[PDB]
């Protein structure tokens, strides 16, 4: 569906499990009015490398990063609940 709102090469944001990662966005596909991303997840080996739909990519700004953060605290108290 036209324009979506990323592009090729834009440094992004993107979710994989409950984690917000830096990233890539290498490609950019339209499929029956759905946009998809294939994404290099940031300092991760290229195997990772995924199609993902739009709503699991946010742009790269200071309200995503406390976002970012917000969760890895959130899941850091996750992983020291499970012991």
Not at 13 to 18: I, N, V, Y
């Amino acid at each position: 569906d036209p324009k979506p709102k990323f592009q090729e090469g834009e440094r992004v944001l993107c979710f994989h499990g409950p984690l917000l990662y830096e990233a890539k966005c290498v490609k950019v596909a339209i499929k029956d009015k759905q946009v998809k991303y294939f994404i290099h997840y940031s300092g991760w080996n290229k195997n990772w490398d995924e199609w993902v739909p739009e709503s699991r990519v946010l742009k790269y700004v200071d309200t995503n990063l406390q976002k970012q953060r917000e969760l890895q605290k959130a899941n850091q108290e996750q992983y020291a609940e499970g012991k």
